[PDB]
Design a binder for these strands. Structure first.
Ligand SMILES: OC[C@H]1O[C@@](CO)(O[C@H]2O[C@H](CO)[C@@H](O)[C@H](O)[C@H]2O)[C@@H](O)[C@@H]1O
Ligand SMILES: [Mg+2]
Lengths: 553, 412
RNA sequence: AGUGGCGGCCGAACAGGGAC
RNA sequence: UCCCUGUUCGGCCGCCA
């Protein structure tokens, strides 16, 4: 028979024709299983045999699971996919369990032979031509082409979710008070009918779907939370992630850390406050995946405490659109932040992490605004509104920042929390030149070829200094001249540099930087009482800046 | 039953495929609505996965509406038809509309709702409507008429437009009219009272040919420029003259006449910074003759229609912004400043979106182009909040720069 | 020995603007 | 030569059908 549900027109790439590639060698153990399946798909109608009028052919094989009889059929659609048209994926993401509103009855249903129940467009069914032999050499073998969407084509997922949107689409107008979220081949149906009447509409939906060719077995697990779905446990009034097993190794390989970090990073979305900065600080300049690497005392300090957060099981609540969203941040030091979204205090909705040391030189106010911009989008996605923000930075600290910063910065409606560590600005460049303090006219230069260079200062009191440098840059010698001036000065100092690079860095009040040299400058700035820093242009014969450049060339 | 002018993409360039960013639920129920009734009227029709083309769409609220406006982001679809709307059916520019003592803006988007669209080209104008937490797959539509915000819609329709306007152009021969995308700019030398009448005249004179206008009044003569200001001081400190010599030397790239030689002699020692110094007469002279050359406009700086417009914005603190519109570096075609606008001293992004919008109008009026924007803000800050404060019907092309104030030249 | 997706890691080209 | 940004393509481990 021809198909029950409307077909979906497909085309090839302009000026390209079907796939032509001959099949692999395969053992007799697997080959026997496929000829059985092809007639079981032929008997059910998913395929049809064809004469030799079809020049196109694409390979096939199979893989068998361990401790299971079932086989997976596979199609090497590489060359059909190369030449199949672009699609616009209708799956813009994966829904997250904290976004589920609270409903009385939650039923999870699974489509059987999901891609095998959609009609591949009659015009395209030709390129799906493949050949299978009975025995590895004797039988010449038969040719068959597809009648449905094949496991392994490039449109089989993008088309199924588009047709199946047409299928659920009237049913949604028939039952506005029941909601069906759709991802891939599972369906989540939820309502505020009783547990009895939820079994009636379940047969109503089972049958409306059966009207189109979709089979939802009753072999599925009934309404018994925790439903296992996407690696979570979804309980009647709560939810949590599937428990986490940590490799207990006396010797750790890089495969051990990389698999471990992903488990810790997945734990964080409900288990609050995990840190991973130093366990990944070990995995930075790693080349081999199996080679062992030791855990420093910091990274070993990071494994133990985290293991202790995960001892107790934790769980989050659901979204209640009448209560507001209140999102709270705590600092973790070393540029790591963890946050919780909730509505009724102590009933966490989800938790999370933001640790991207973004930029080379960032401070605690830039990093607190970067955590805000990520909580704000992760909330716009899941709940479609901006939460209210509890933020541990004084209403006056933040008032001084955005008024003075040169990039426009904004935070939504937020309030103050005094959960120390409070985040604050660690110093302040003066705006007018200090009187009575020695003025340091600094400059630096290096040679790109020899990577040798000099950094130093001439002051008003006559003091000078030049320091040779080895395997260094022109940028890195200017950042160093200013460090010489800060060491060799009192608590009040003036500095005149021609480094746009350095003056840019310093002026951004940065307290944590990835370059160990920039952290040298931050610490001396923190210990001074009055620092004033100004810029003159180079090679304009300005004061001693014209001179000190001669000493640094 | 009107014949359809054919449209095809620029040579060898595929159609737009831009990912649709998440939206606040308050602009979802409204764009779910605006498309229900546009589909019930037949203006748009749902599509499926066979279309690999998508263009962003979101919702603005025009100034004091409480009735949502649908706005689509056609910049990638726009820059891909360019030979159609620039070399072929373009729109000329009324060099004198900028002189008019008063100019009004009127939104003509309703007129694009009628005229039908080539059938080849409706596959490149499809937009998805997102749903919250990736529940419903995105409800993808496409455009059966001349869409709102495209840059090919005012090129096709300009004929049917000239005929609708032809009675009113003969009736008032002084008045100047210019049409840009979804907007219409009417310009007369009449006074604000007699002026507000003439628009109501053109409002009904176009309302009778089927255009429904959903006032915005410009004053292109009153427009000021931003002076490159040097400080005027009784006493100068060693620090003051290094800052000054820095501005003049940063300035010598635009106005080639500046000089710093004799004011640098003033800084001949390796001195303290706060020490006051007497200006020599050769340096009082250098200081003055410099204060003059800045009274004049830049030399030989003239608009070149082939080049793109560039606009840079600097955040001068205290709710004040400076900007420059140019095409080649240090050849400024315009300068400006903005102060205490809406969102003053309470919000910066609200302020910038006000800044960006008010700059786009100044350029469309003087050059018929949307200047390309260099935004002083981080990228995720602009995306997340701009459409809340965006009220215009076009969208300029922008990039985000991380530039510190090496010289805070423009005001001080 | 297939494909898509999600988390982790590593780089590869392309383009932008600044610093010499 | 230098730095940061952005985009656009690639290798392995863990999970899904
Ligand atoms: O902020 C730029 C951001 O916008 C996107 C998609 O919306 O690209 C658009 O903006 C670019 C910069 O103005 C345009 O040049 C481009 O044509 C347009 O699609 C993203 O690509 C980009 O991240
Ligand atoms: Mg130098």
């Amino acid at each position: 028979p021809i198909s029950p549900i409307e077909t979906v027109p497909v085309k090839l790439k302009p000026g390209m024709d079907g796939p032509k590639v001959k099949q692999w060698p395969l053992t007799e153990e697997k080959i026997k299983a496929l000829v059985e399946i092809c007639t079981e798909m032929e008997k059910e109608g998913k395929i049809s045999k064809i004469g030799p009028e079809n020049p196109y052919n694409t390979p096939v094989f199979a893989i068998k699971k361990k401790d299971s009889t079932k086989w997976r059929k596979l199609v090497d659609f590489r060359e059909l996919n190369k030449r199949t048209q672009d699609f616009w994926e209708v799956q813009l993401g994966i829904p997250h369990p904290a976004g589920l509103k609270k409903k009385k009855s939650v039923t999870v249903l699974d489509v059987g032979d999901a891609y095998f129940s959609v009609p591949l467009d009659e015009d395209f069914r030709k390129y799906t031509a493949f050949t299978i032999p009975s025995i590895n050499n004797e039988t010449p073998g038969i040719r068959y082409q597809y009648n449905v969407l094949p496991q392994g084509w490039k449109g089989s997922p993008a088309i199924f979710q588009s047709s199946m949107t047409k299928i659920l689409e009237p049913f949604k107008k028939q039952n506005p008070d029941i909601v069906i979220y759709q991802y891939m081949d599972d369906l989540y149906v939820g309502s505020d009918l009783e547990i009895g009447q939820h079994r009636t509409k379940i047969e109503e939906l089972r049958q409306h779907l059966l009207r189109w060719g979709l089979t939802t077995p009753d072999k599925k697990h009934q309404k018994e939370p925790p439903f296992l779905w996407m690696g979570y446990e979804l309980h009647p009034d709560k939810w949590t992630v599937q428990p986490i097993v940590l490799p207990e190794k006396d010797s750790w390989t890089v495969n051990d850390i990389c698999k471990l970090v992903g488990k810790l990073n997945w734990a964080s979305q409900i288990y609050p406050g995990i840190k991973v900065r130093q366990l990944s600080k070990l995995l930075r300049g790693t080349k081999a995946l199996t080679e062992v690497i030791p855990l420093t005392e910091e990274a070993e300090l990071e494994l133990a405490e985290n293991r202790e957060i995960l001892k107790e099981p934790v769980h989050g609540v659901y979204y209640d659109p009448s209560k507001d969203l209140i999102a709270e941040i705590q600092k973790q030091g070393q540029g790591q932040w963890t946050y919780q979204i909730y509505q009724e205090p102590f009933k966490n909705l989800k938790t999370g992490k933001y640790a991207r040391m973004r930029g080379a030189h960032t401070n605690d106010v830039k990093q607190l605004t970067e955590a805000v911009q990520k909580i704000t989008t992760e909330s716009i996605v899941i709940w479609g509104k901006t939460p209210k923000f509890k933020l541990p930075i004084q209403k006056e600290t933040w008032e001084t920042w955005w008024t003075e910063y040169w990039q426009a910065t904004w935070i939504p409606e937020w309030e103050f929390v005094n959960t120390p560590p409070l985040v604050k600005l660690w110093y302040q460049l003066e705006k007018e030149p200090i009187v009575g303090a020695e003025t340091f006219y600094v400059d630096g230069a290096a040679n790109r070829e020899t990577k040798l260079g000099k950094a130093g200062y001439v002051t008003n009191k006559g003091r000078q200094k030049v320091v040779p440098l080895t395997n260094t840059t022109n940028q890195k010698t200017e950042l160093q001249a200013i460090y010489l001036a800060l060491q060799d000065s009192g608590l009040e100092v003036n500095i005149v540099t021609n480094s746009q690079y350095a003056l840019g860095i310093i002026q951004a009040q940065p307290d944590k930087s990835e370059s160990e040299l920039v952290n040298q400058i931050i610490e001396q700035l923190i210990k001074k009482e009055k620092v004033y820093l100004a810029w003159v242009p180079a090679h304009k014969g300005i004061g001693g800046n014209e001179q000190v450049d001669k000493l640094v060339s | 039953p009107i014949e359809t002018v054919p449209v095809k993409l620029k040579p060898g360039m595929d159609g737009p495929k831009v990912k649709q960013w998440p939206l606040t639920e308050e602009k979802i129920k409204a764009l779910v609505e605006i498309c229900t009734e546009m589909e019930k009227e037949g203006k748009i029709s749902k599509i499926g996965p066979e279309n690999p083309y998508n263009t962003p769409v979101f919702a603005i609220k025009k100034k004091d509406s409480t009735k949502w406006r649908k706005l689509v982001d056609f910049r990638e679809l726009n820059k891909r038809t360019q030979d159609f709307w620039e070399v072929q059916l373009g729109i000329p520019h009324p060099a004198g509309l900028k002189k008019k003592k008063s100019v009004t803006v009127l939104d003509v988007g309703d007129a694009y709702f009628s005229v039908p669209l080539d059938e080849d080209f409706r596959k490149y104008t499809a937009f998805t409507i997102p749903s919250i937490n990736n529940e419903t797959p995105g409800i993808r539509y496409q455009y059966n008429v001349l869409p709102q915000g495209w840059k090919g819609s005012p090129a096709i329709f300009q004929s049917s437009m000239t005929k609708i306007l032809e009675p009113f152009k003969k009736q008032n021969p002084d008045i100047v009219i210019y049409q840009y995308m979804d907007d219409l700019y009417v310009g007369s030398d009449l006074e604000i009272g007699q002026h507000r009448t003439k628009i109501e005249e053109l409002r009904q004179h176009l309302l009778r040919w089927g255009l429904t206008t959903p006032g915005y009044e410009l004053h292109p003569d009153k427009w000021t420029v931003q002076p490159i200001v040097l400080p005027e001081k009784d006493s100068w400190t060693v620090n003051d003259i290094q800052k000054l010599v820095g501005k003049l030397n940063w300035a010598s790239q635009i106005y080639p006449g500046i000089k710093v030689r004799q004011l640098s002699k003033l800084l001949r020692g390796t001195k303290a910074l706060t020490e006051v110094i007497p200006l020599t007469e050769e340096a009082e002279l250098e200081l003055a003759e410099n204060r003059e050359i800045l009274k004049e406009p830049v030399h030989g700086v003239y608009y070149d229609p082939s080049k793109d417009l560039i606009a840079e914005i600097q955040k001068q603190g205290q709710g004040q912004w400076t900007y420059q519109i140019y095409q080649e570096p240090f050849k400024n075609l315009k300068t400006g400043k903005y102060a205490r606008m809406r969102g003053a001293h309470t919000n910066d992004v609200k302020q910038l979106t006000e800044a960006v919008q008010k700059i786009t109008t100044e350029s469309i009026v003087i050059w018929g182009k949307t200047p390309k924007f260099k935004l002083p803000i981080q990228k995720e800050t602009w995306e997340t909040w701009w459409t809340e404060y965006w009220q215009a019907t076009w969208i300029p092309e922008w990039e985000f720069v991380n530039t510190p104030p090496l010289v805070k030249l423009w005001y001080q």
